[PDB]
């Protein structure tokens, strides 16, 4: 009713230790969401064209052309690691566990309170106003993860959070022929428009049922049950140079020290083994046959163009290129007492050794005369196309059937948790933004809107926008995310790497004297793992 609570606040993380080394992790997240009335109750089709920056020769990468439908609805996203875990629970997980499954997810909206502003300013209660809630359970509306724009709910249980205004990409065409500083022509910079065969205008009113929650109502999305693969919290270190049986050392060191090395007491052209170079007798560590290949090379900072413009080719694993950079604001980890619009940024350097070092590759003629001359080698220091800053490693692809690579690690707290699978015939082997991927169906999105509060002078035949009473809502959101983890076992004599607090990172976990908080990024895949 009007004076009865419809739910409870719960932000506890429960660890239930089943037998056989399996743990259930129930993460409860509760927030107070503050929502304003839409700027306009109409759907807009807006085109963004930053001609000012891309008309300059050399600024192709600064392209921001697109078309989007702007919607009067807002999205409530909780697809980020920081909504569910604090540094302590994250330490416990990444120090005690080895894998991680995604079991269940559920949401609720309760304790809705709608208010009206009257202009000093007076704030009255609208006991009869309503808040529209829509849940796209069938996954009809386009998927839109907020973690890529850093627009999820906040990371603090004691800080009120806002939802993000919903919008989606409308089709368009764009051609941007690249150039450089010193081009003699004006190649082409044209926004064509929309192909009528690809138009797609979605509305929440025509696709999903909308519930109207008043002050004493509550919404409860049932529990969604995932079915995915386990994310591993262990990293691998073995490259192709560390796979299999090492070579037998005929001369072992006698005086234990720092510069006393061992010696394989056999000439390189008199060794035994298998090679894939069928025209040479040398058996070394760079030439011996390994089972497969760990990682691959890919053209880095490469831009492929398509009907909607140029885009960067994504890299699976990096070692610079491949490492994701996260930028975020005061709601998502930045010091809440800083001033300015400069976001906090960090590059996540993963622990896994599955990248490449292009300054150390080379190609040589099949003759293999080992002391190699100039005309029989291609180094990462020779010009390709006459360009001093482009070598062959920039246009090199070594992805083949013998390539083995790992999935991306969780990024606390700004990384995404789950992702939807592409609705194509041939699916990608992994995503670079989320460790988990909903293959068949994924949790539905939760849109919120505040119902139109009309005045007494309303004319639908008036070209001007409707006059509404200034209304805003504050409700409470609750979420339950259930994981399954395995507890790790020690197989080595030596300890392993663990996450801990120390004198350097001490004040990143406690607030300042003025209430300033921050959530620094933590590594996830700490312990090593045997590959072969």
């Amino acid at each position: 009713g009007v004076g009865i609570s419809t739910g409870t606040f719960n932000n506890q993380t429960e660890f239930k230790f089943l037998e056989n080394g399996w743990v259930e992790i129930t993460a409860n997240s509760s927030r107070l969401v503050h929502l304003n009335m839409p700027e306009s109750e109409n759907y807009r089709r807006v085109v963004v064209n930053n001609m000012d920056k891309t008309a300059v020769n050399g600024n192709m990468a600064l392209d921001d052309i697109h078309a989007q439908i702007v919607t009067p609805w807002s999205l409530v996203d909780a697809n980020a690691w920081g909504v569910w875990f604090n540094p302590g629970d994250w330490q416990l997980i990444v120090n005690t566990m080895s894998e991680l499954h995604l079991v269940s997810f559920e949401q609720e909206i309760f304790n809705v309170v709608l208010k009206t502003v009257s202009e000093t300013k007076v704030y009255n209660n609208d006991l009869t106003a309503s808040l529209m809630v829509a849940l796209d359970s069938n996954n009809t509306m386009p998927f839109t993860p907020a973690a890529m724009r850093s627009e999820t709910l906040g990371f603090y249980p004691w800080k009120p959070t806002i939802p993000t205004p919903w919008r989606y990409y409308f089709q368009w065409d764009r051609t941007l022929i690249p150039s450089h500083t010193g081009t003699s022509g004006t190649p082409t910079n044209i926004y064509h428009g929309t192909d009528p065969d690809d138009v797609q205008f979605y509305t929440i009113e025509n696709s999903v049922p909308v519930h109207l929650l008043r002050t004493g109502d509550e919404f409860a999305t049932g529990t969604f049950f995932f079915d995915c693969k386990p994310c591993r919290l262990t990293h691998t270190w073995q490259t192709n140079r560390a796979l299999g049986l090492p070579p037998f050392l005929n001369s072992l060191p006698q005086s234990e020290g720092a510069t006393n090395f061992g010696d394989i007491g056999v000439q390189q052209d008199k060794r035994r083994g298998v090679t894939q170079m069928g025209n040479t007798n040398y058996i070394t560590e760079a030439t011996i046959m390994r089972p497969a290949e760990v990682g691959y090379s890919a053209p880095y900072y490469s831009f492929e163009a398509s009907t909607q413009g140029p885009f960067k080719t994504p890299i699976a694993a990096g070692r610079a290129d491949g490492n994701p950079r996260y930028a975020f604001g005061r709601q998502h980890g930045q010091k809440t007492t800083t001033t300015g619009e400069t976001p906090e940024r960090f590059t996540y350097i993963a622990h896994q050794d599955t990248g490449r070092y292009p300054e150390g590759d080379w190609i040589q003629n099949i003759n293999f005369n080992l002391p190699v001359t100039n005309d029989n080698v291609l180094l990462p220091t020779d010009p390709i196309g006459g360009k001093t800053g482009i070598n062959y490693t920039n246009i090199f692809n070594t992805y083949g059937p013998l390539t083995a690579l790992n999935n991306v690690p969780p990024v606390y707290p700004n990384g995404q948790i789950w992702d939807k699978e592409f609705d194509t015939d041939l699916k990608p082997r992994l995503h670079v933004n989320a460790p988990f991927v909903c293959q068949n169906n994924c949790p539905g999105q939760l849109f919120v809107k505040v119902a139109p509060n009309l005045t007494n002078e309303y004319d639908p035949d008036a070209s001007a926008n409707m006059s509404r009473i200034v209304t805003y809502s504050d409700f409470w959101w609750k979420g339950k995310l259930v994981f399954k983890a395995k507890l790790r076992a020690s197989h080595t004599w030596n300890p392993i790497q663990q996450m801990s607090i120390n004198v350097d990172n001490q004040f990143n976990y406690v607030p300042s004297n003025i209430g300033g908080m921050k959530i620094v990024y933590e590594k996830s895949q700490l312990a090593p793992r045997k590959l072969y």
Partner: antibody, heavy 119, light 108 residues
Framework: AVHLQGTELVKPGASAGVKLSCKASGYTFTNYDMNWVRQRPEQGLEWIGWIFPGDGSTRYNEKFKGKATLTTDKSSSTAYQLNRLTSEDSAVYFC?????????????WGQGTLVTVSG | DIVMTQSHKFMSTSVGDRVSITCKASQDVNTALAWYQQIPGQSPKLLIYSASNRYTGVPDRFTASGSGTDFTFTISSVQAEDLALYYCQQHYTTPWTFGGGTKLEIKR
């Protein structure tokens, strides 16, 4: 019909700053960055920086970093330079705009505003 | 920073001759070069961009060529309205740097 109109002479003392202005007419102001150049009678022309009025994005050179700050004003189509310390920086300042091509050539220049620092 | 040096500061010239101003760059700029003309006491006027292309409205007597570190800007037939201060700008990388200038004269 692109026209850039700068303010006229100024004579500040050797302690303060002066704000030079440049009014643009004849084009979408937010479609082109505004560049500021300097001409001393002995050291030649020199580029101070540029300001993109949409998004208000600046870039200077290392010489005029703490010496000049650029600012834009839409709804009036004006560009401003601040000239912080102005010790003996007496020269003619120009407000320039790219052109139609795409290279950072300067097709349209202002008439120039002279700044003399004395006592 | 790229320093751009024009060979001479004053170049003798008689009306009707062919004059060739030279410009050198500290490092290799591919084409990346613009040529300006300034009458003493006015604003510069853009003559050439990309070291070969002629801006709209420039008379066909001004041409330019070159690449890398050497560039040349030539007038095939001088007029009295062409004796000015010619500047050499590079638009290869920031900061944009100009040359010192070469004033064209009339022979004494």
């Amino acid at each position: 019909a692109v026209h850039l109109q700068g303010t006229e002479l100024v004579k500040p003392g050797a302690s303060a700053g002066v704000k030079l202005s440049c009014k643009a007419s004849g084009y979408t102001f937010t479609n082109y960055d505004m560049n500021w150049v300097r001409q001393r009678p002995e050291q030649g022309l020199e580029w101070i920086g540029w300001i993109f009025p949409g998004d208000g994005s600046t870039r200077y050179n290392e010489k005029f970093k703490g010496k000049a700050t650029l600012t834009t004003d839409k709804s009036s189509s004006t560009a401003y330079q601040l000239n912080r310390l102005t010790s003996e920086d007496s020269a003619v300042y120009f407000c320039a705009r790219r052109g139609s091509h795409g290279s950072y050539s300067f097709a349209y220049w202002g008439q120039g505003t002279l700044v003399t620092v004395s006592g | 920073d790229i320093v751009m040096t024009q060979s001479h500061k004053f170049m003798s010239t008689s009306v009707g001759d062919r004059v060739s101003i030279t410009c050198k760059a500290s490092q290799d700029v591919n084409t990346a070069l613009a040529w300006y003309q300034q009458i003493p006491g006015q604003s510069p006027k853009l003559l050439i961009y990309s070291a070969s292309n002629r801006y709209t409205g420039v008379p066909d007597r001004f041409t330019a060529s070159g690449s890398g570190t050497d560039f040349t800007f030539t007038i095939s037939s001088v007029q009295a309205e062409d004796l000015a201060l010619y500047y050499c700008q590079q638009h290869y990388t920031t900061p944009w740097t100009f040359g010192g200038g070469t004033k064209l004269e009339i022979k004494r």
